[PDB]
Design an enzyme around this catalytic site. Structure first.
Site, mmCIF file in Angstrom:
data_model
loop_
_atom_site.group_PDB
_atom_site.id
_atom_site.type_symbol
_atom_site.label_atom_id
_atom_site.label_comp_id
_atom_site.label_asym_id
_atom_site.label_seq_id
_atom_site.Cartn_x
_atom_site.Cartn_y
_atom_site.Cartn_z
ATOM 1 N N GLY A 113 -39.604 17.315 25.540
ATOM 2 C CA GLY A 113 -38.216 17.059 25.966
ATOM 3 C C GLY A 113 -37.251 17.156 24.800
ATOM 4 N N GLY A 138 -36.390 19.991 23.476
ATOM 5 C CA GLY A 138 -35.837 21.357 23.523
ATOM 6 C C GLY A 138 -36.547 22.300 22.569
ATOM 7 C CE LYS A 139 -42.172 20.696 20.684
ATOM 8 N NZ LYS A 139 -43.008 19.717 21.416
ATOM 9 C CB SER A 140 -39.425 25.683 25.315
ATOM 10 O OG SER A 140 -39.240 24.385 25.865
ATOM 11 C CE1 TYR A 141 -30.555 23.939 24.510
ATOM 12 C CE2 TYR A 141 -31.596 23.530 22.400
ATOM 13 C CZ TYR A 141 -30.450 23.664 23.159
ATOM 14 O OH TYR A 141 -29.225 23.514 22.576
ATOM 15 C CG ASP A 190 -43.180 26.857 22.857
ATOM 16 O OD1 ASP A 190 -42.962 25.730 22.375
ATOM 17 O OD2 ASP A 190 -43.230 27.096 24.078
ATOM 18 N N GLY A 231 -46.130 18.963 22.103
ATOM 19 C CA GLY A 231 -45.800 17.664 21.488
ATOM 20 C C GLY A 231 -46.934 16.666 21.632
#
Ligand SMILES: Nc1ncnc2c1ncn2[C@@H]1O[C@H](COP(=O)(O)OP(=O)(O)NP(=O)(O)O)[C@@H](O)[C@H]1O
Ligand SMILES: Nc1ncnc2c1ncn2[C@@H]1O[C@H](COP(=O)(O)OP(=O)(O)NP(=O)(O)O)[C@@H](O)[C@H]1O
Ligand SMILES: [Mg+2]
Ligand SMILES: [Mg+2]
Lengths: 366, 365
Positions: free
Chosen positions: A96, A98-101, A249, A252
């Site tokens: 949550g 935003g690592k992908s974001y 990517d 967590g």
């Protein structure tokens, strides 16, 4: 070039979850310097990074979009790629955050990965000449329970189509995957289609922390070769360079106390935490090496590290991006992330360009 | 006094072999001719005083048919006219192209027509009334150590395969009894009779080809020069003559590869025997050519027995080996050139010609 890794950081703001269950702010950006207030208000930790962005708010200076962050962080790596350097960027942080974001982003605000990709395709358009011919390929794969799977494969029709692969270590070029279906790129459009298929088939799932979680590790490789003229009166186009770009990517921690789950869920979470720990140890010994320390590097303690060996170190111009949260609910996680990053700046590898003048005499003349 | 020249005529690829895209294994470097293993297990080299590279029109030193003739066959015309006997051997396997060199084609002639018509024309040089000339020819075959005349047409009988016998003239040398002669002054008529001859010649359909040579054929020309001289009276009776002996040898063939039965195997055996004998003979002649004193087993076969005088003393000869360049008959080619060589065969192994680019050694030095 014995040179360091660019370490960048992005404090994302809080969410509906904090709105519902109030979670105060404790991360604060002095333009770029990171500062974290203990909820006890007993300590302020602070960390310095080569790069910062303050996405907590849109207004105060330090703010940056996906492409601002790109031209800060990833366009230079595009530059070194066309210079011929292998390059790396990999993400880190919690669920949550935003690592992908950031790396990939979504449809409406795609990430550093798609920004770099279109920049790369058009940068080839800048020199689409007979002075230098260009050839680009890419692969895209995933890591789940230490098992490697191909994101660009249309699965068959069966109850179990997650075909595992395995790793092999070329004595020279290092690890690689068997059957990895690296495919040709004509343009960023093709890249986009490939990425869409892969991210769709990725083994991701909803949970109690986010609506959709990266429960598997994702690797996105490009390799651009560029065949150039040599300095001879004979066959001129006998020089070539290659450059391998690696965009990663990760997943967590997903501490089970909040990530209450069972069965395969907990299994995936366990494997993930194990992988990330191994990575952290790699990172740490790398830092010690950069301090001049004679140290054994357990690349082989997992798959992620083993494949990413030449990127975590080796020969490449590299970077990391760390994602962190403002909510005090996860201050411990954010601190761990920041400490990971601030240690990460200290890492260096020895980065050159992959001419591969094999059976050429060019490097020997040089 | 005799001497021999040993030479080789390389054939190019065929439409068949080019269609197969068959590999080349024969290569040359000067007169040296080399064979490279496909797996590079061995790289061999055979050596000749002359090499006739009819592999590619575009190559340096291409040998055409007349090139061959004026290189090796023509000098023998001079020597035969000079007044000692001459011979030319041809030895090679089936498909090598012996006829292509010797008889050539009806449009692209061989050394046979070249020599024949040349010698007609060259005797016409000296057709004086002082000296008379008279020309004859004979043609016979050796098969299972049996002689048969090639100039009798088979009759309407079981056969006319009438065996003849060799007798040793007490003075001149061995000859054949009962051999009918004809006289010549035209190569057209040479060919008139040869039409009968190479039809009556025994042949067989093997696997290497559909019409193989199962009998050695010897074709000799009789040259008579009759001169007159000042003798304080009637000028008459100064006689000099010579002979010109063409040898269409037969291919060896390993019976192990020619899996068959009966008369075919018998012929193969006999043929191999003859070849072996001849190899011994020729090597001995070479050793005496360098001056080694030695005994000659002329008598170990009919063919050498006949040719004994044609091979000895004042006798000028050559032998042409024929070969194919194709990788597929590589064994046959090595065999043929092995027969042909008269000192030894070179061999080595080498897979280092690739210096990875543009002589990397020039940098490594
Ligand atoms: N700085 C930010 N500004 C605006 N929106 C953000 C920011 N960071 C994240 N988001 C959005 O909030 C959501 C939460 O991020 P999320 O994608 O769940 O993290 P993540 O990268 O998935 N972590 P993981 O699933 O463990 O890999 C995303 O869908 C983003 O669109
Ligand atoms: N130097 C050459 N150039 C072009 N074609 C050649 C050459 N030598 C041989 N050939 C071809 O190969 C054949 C050699 O003679 P020919 O008798 O016709 O074939 P063969 O089966 O080899 N007969 P033989 O003479 O008994 O070996 C000819 O028919 C030519 O077409
Ligand atoms: Mg994610
Ligand atoms: Mg022939």
């Amino acid at each position: 070039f014995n040179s360091q890794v660019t370490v960048a950081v992005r404090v994302r703001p809080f969410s509906k979850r904090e709105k519902t269950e109030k979670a105060s702010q404790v991360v604060f950006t002095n333009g770029e310097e990171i500062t974290v207030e203990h909820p006890d208000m007993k300590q302020v930790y602070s960390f310095i990074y080569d790069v910062s962005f303050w996405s907590f708010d849109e207004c105060h200076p330090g703010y940056a979009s996906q492409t601002t962050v790109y031209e800060t962080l990833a366009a230079p790596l595009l530059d070194r790629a066309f210079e011929g350097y292998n390059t790396c960027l990999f993400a880190y942080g919690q669920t949550g955050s935003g690592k992908s974001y950031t790396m990939m982003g979504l449809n409406e605000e795609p990430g550093i990965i798609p920004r770099f990709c279109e920049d790369l395709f058009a940068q080839i358009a800048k020199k689409q000449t007979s002075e230098v011919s260009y050839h680009l390929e890419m692969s895209f794969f995933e890591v789940y329970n230490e098992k490697i799977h191909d994101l660009l494969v249309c699965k068959g029709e069966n109850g179990q189509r997650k075909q595992p692969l395995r790793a092999r270590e070329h004595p020279v070029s290092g690890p690689y995957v068997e059957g990895l279906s690296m495919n040709v790129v004509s343009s960023y459009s093709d890249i986009q289609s490939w990425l869409e298929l892969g991210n769709k088939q990725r083994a991701t799932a909803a949970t109690g922390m986010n609506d959709k979680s990266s429960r598997s590790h994702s690797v996105f490789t490009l390799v651009m070769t560029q065949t150039k003229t040599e300095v001879v009166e004979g066959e001129e186009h006998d020089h070539r360079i290659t450059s391998r770009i690696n965009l990663v990517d990760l997943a967590g921690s997903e501490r089970c106390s909040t990530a209450h789950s069972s069965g395969q869920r907990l299994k995936e979470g366990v494997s993930i935490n194990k992988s990330l720990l191994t990575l952290g140890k790699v990172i740490s010994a790398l830092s010690e090496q950069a301090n001049g320390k004679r140290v054994f590097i357990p690349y082989r303690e997992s798959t992620l590290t083993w494949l990413l060996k030449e990127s975590l170190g080796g020969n490449s111009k590299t970077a990391m991006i760390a994602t962190v949260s403002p909510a005090a609910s996860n201050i411990e996680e954010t601190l761990s992330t920041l400490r990971y990053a601030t240690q990460a700046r200290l890492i260096v590898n020895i980065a050159k360009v992959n001419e591969d003048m094999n059976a050429k005499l060019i490097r020997e003349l040089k």
